[PDB]
């Protein structure tokens, strides 16, 4: 619980894939990237696999994945609960 425990600390990209393959579509993990220190990544169970998005940022502190921008990560997550996170399939975030 709150702070440490809304990201899975110490988890690799492929570990996230391993965990999420055991879950249904739309389930997800937010993690600190190892490949790009100082980035956050969102791993998301799709129909047949697990795919990864990079949390994009600007100089004003906004958060984004595609084009809609948000003043927090939490707001970004909530937006992708009801708008698809994928541009090819319908994938809503669930927890």
């Amino acid at each position: 619980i709150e702070f440490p425990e809304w990201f899975h600390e110490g988890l690799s990209r492929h570990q996230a894939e391993n965990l999420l393959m055991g879950k249904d579509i739309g389930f997800f993990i937010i993690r600190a990237s190892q490949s790009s220190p100082g980035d956050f990544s969102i791993s998301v169970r799709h129909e047949d696999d697990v795919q990864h998005f990079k949390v994009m940022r600007d100089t004003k502190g906004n958060y984004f994945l595609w084009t809609e921008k948000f003043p927090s990560l939490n707001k970004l997550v909530d937006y992708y609960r009801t708008t698809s996170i994928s541009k090819q399939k319908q994938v809503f975030l669930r927890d």
């Binding site: 990209r13 490949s35 795919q51 990864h52 998005f53 990079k54 994009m56 595609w66 994928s86």
Partner: peptide, 6 residues
């Protein structure tokens, strides 16, 4: 590495 949105 490879990201859906990159």
């Amino acid at each position: 590495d490879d990201y859906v949105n990159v």
